[PDB]
Symmetry: D2
Subunit: 95 residues, 4 copies
């Protein structure tokens, strides 16, 4: 089961998502919403294993046709890539 935080709810109401009382979870765009932290943990984990760029994971994700609406996906995705030091090194290569 999904567990949401105040921040999550704040972003969700601000996003225009609905909370399904009987269902235990929020919905947006006809999908169950994946919380921010869950989304981050997942995305971080994916980047660690592939170290794919922002543009690349994003396209791969949208193509993955996820059952879940990943809250703050792109924002979190950027943070992860932009702060990945491994990615930073493999791209700091000018002579």
């Amino acid at each position: 089961h999904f567990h949401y935080t105040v921040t999550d709810i704040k972003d969700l109401t601000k996003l225009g998502a609905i909370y399904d009382k009987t269902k235990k979870y929020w919905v947006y765009q006809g999908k169950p919403v994946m919380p921010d932290q869950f989304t981050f943990e997942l995305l971080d984990f994916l980047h660690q294993l592939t170290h794919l760029s922002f543009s690349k994971m994003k396209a791969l994700l949208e193509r993955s046709h996820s059952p879940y609406y990943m809250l703050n996906r792109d924002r979190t995705l950027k943070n992860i890539t932009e702060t990945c030091k491994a990615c930073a090194q493999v791209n700091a290569s000018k002579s």
Copy 2:
């Protein structure tokens, strides 16, 4: 010990490298020469684990300050990347 093929020798003489009789191996640019197949096997192996692009591995390599002159490096490097289907998929995500 390094083992060279006819093709290797053909490219080496064409490259202007010298063969060190007493040393058992060819030299180019003051480095022992890494044969073509050895170079390929190595590079392929590296690409499989990182799936880094051509431009990226190349820069990483030149920065690695290898003890060996990798025969037909760039040519082989291109082939590997250009024919990597995993790389092909992660980049076929265009709209």
Copy 3:
């Protein structure tokens, strides 16, 4: 939409799955069935990016709670790992 082959249907009927006429796809264990080739292409693609072992991807997959029943998953998963030369090299390391 999913496209199935004779082989797929042969394994599916042999598996005890049902084909949903109106739905266009086979179902097994309450999930839409992912064809063999689709499953393979996907799994191969995952292994290429992580090169995780059999035991590891399997557990990761079962934990992923997939919406789809991946046809011939374990059999295909084994083949991929057992024939991955990169995995073969990183593990051929005895002195």
Copy 4:
């Protein structure tokens, strides 16, 4: 050029390595010594891209026939792997 710290020198003298005045660097086992932090940064970077286990990187390294003696290699290598959360997750899949 290599830059060494007090800690490095402390471990180096304790290791029995010599410092080559004219050469600017310490030597151990006939190799130029790679400082601790440099070794760590390098090893961390390698683990990020492959997430190979301790036993695996170690064997791969020894097989790499490095020109440099990597200071505190195994100790640092362990720390990196043992504290890698990605590795922790991919292996926390136990039942």
